[PDB]
Amino acid sequence: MATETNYPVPYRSKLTEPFEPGQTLIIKGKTAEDSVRFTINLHNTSADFSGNDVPLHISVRFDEGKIVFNTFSKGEWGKEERKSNPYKKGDDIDIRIRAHDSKFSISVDQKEVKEYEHRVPLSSVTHFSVDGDILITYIHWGGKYYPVPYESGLAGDGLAPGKSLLIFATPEKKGKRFHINLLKKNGDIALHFNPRFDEKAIVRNSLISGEWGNEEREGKNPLEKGIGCDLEFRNEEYAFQIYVDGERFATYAHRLDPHDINGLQIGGDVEVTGIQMV
C-alpha cells in the first residue's frame, strides 16, 4: 500500500466499448509480505449497480497457493477452475487476459497458464475491477489481432524525439527469428531490430539507400520462445534506447536524422498483441 496516486483499490473502470476478441487486459502490481489475496473481475453493469454478471472472476490466493477462475451469472457461481500460484507474498505480479472468440487466454509473468472457455457472453463484459491485497502499478486495455507481416504508418509526428513505441509480442514457440523496422518515408530503415534465436543474438542495423550498415549485436538476448515480451523503442537525443521487459537491453546511435520516423513493419516468426505510442 505504498505510493499509489494512480490506481487505488478498489479499482473500477467502465470500458469505452465491449471487450472484443483480440484485445488484452494487462494488470501489473506489487504485493506485501502480509498480502493474502486479490481479485481481478471482468463484469456486467453500466452505471454502478455492482451486482450483475461476472463473465470471468480471477482470485489469486497466497494462502491457498493458487489462482482460481470462475463465473457468476443468474445469481449463481459455477465450478471453480484452478492453477498453481507461482508468486510468493511480496513479489511483483503481472497478469494478462486476452479475449478470443471461444475463451480467455490468461498469462502470468508473460507465460500462458490458463485457457478459460466462455461460459456466458463475452459481450456481457462492460467493466473490469481489481481489489484486494495489491498495489496496482500498471493497467492497460486494448490491442487487437495484428496480422504479421505487419505494416502501418505512425501517427503524424511518428516516433519523434522524447517518444516511445511500445510493442507487446510473443516470439513463436518453434520460431527462429523475427524483426521490427522503424522506417522513414523514403524506405530507409532507421532501426532494424532482429532477434535471432538460432544465433542467440539480436541484430540491430540500418538500411540506407538500399544498403545495410555495420550491424550491432552482442548482448544477453533476453527473449525466450513462446513467452510474451514488452519491447520499447525510446527515441532519445543521441540514440534509440531499446528496452526489453522493463530493462535497457541496448542503445543504438542514430545513423539517420531522428524525426520523421513514420513507418513500422513487423515480420518473421512472431505474434503481435499490442502496439502503442507513448
Side-chain angles (χ1 to χ4, degrees), residues 103-278:
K103 87 288 203 181
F104 290 102
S105 292
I106 301 104
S107 297
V108 182
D109 286 340
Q110 300 268 44
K111 178 157 182 172
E112 81 301 307
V113 294
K114 182 63 169 53
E115 285 191 345
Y116 191 83
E117 294 178 50
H118 294 310
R119 318 225 293 223
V120 295
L122 166 65
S123 61
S124 176
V125 177
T126 59
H127 301 254
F128 74 89
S129 68
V130 182
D131 200 8
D133 306 329
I134 181 175
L135 172 61
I136 307 179
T137 63
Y138 180 86
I139 295 177
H140 184 274
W141 166 62
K144 61 180 179 66
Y145 284 111
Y146 297 87
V148 309
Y150 183 83
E151 189 178 6
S152 78
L154 297 180
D157 212 63
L159 221 192
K163 286 291 186 177
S164 173
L165 176 62
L166 238 176
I167 296 179
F168 294 143
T170 303
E172 306 185 321
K173 296 283 188 181
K174 311 179 188 300
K176 295 298 183 177
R177 60 182 63 178
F178 71 98
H179 69 280
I180 296 170
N181 296 323
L182 306 182
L183 313 86
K184 285 174 162 290
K185 269 295 186 180
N186 77 330
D188 288 331
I189 299 176
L191 172 60
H192 171 71
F193 179 77
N194 180 209
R196 302 179 182 184
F197 296 94
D198 56 65
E199 285 171 42
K200 303 179 188 300
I202 295 183
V203 174
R204 291 90 74 181
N205 208 333
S206 284
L207 185 67
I208 309 178
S209 181
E211 296 296 302
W212 288 108
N214 170 51
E215 204 179 67
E216 290 171 42
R217 335 83 83 296
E218 299 302 358
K220 178 186 183 63
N221 189 309
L223 301 304
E224 188 178 308
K225 299 179 180 182
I227 183 184
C229 68
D230 295 347
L231 304 169
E232 169 175 43
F233 296 92
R234 302 181 180 175
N235 182 166
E236 288 188 354
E237 206 183 321
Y238 311 111
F240 280 110
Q241 301 297 300
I242 307 175
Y243 284 71
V244 177
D245 303 322
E247 300 182 59
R248 185 185 74 66
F249 167 66
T251 55
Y252 184 87
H254 294 300
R255 300 190 188 173
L256 292 65
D257 171 63
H259 313 79
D260 309 312
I261 293 177
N262 64 172
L264 170 68
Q265 302 178 324
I266 303 178
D269 316 323
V270 59
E271 191 179 345
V272 176
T273 63
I275 301 178
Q276 61 189 100
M277 189 64 86
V278 177

Side-chain angles (χ1 to χ4, degrees), residues 9-10 17 25 27 33 50 67 71 79 94 96 102 123 165 167-168 174 180 184 188 195 199 220 247 274:
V9 303
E17 300 301 305
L25 169 60
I27 300 167
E33 54 180 358
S50 182
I67 301 174
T71 160
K79 43 82 176 185
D94 183 326
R96 306 183 188 205
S102 68
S123 61
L165 176 62
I167 296 179
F168 294 143
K174 311 179 188 300
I180 296 170
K184 285 174 162 290
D188 288 331
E199 285 171 42
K220 178 186 183 63
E247 300 182 59

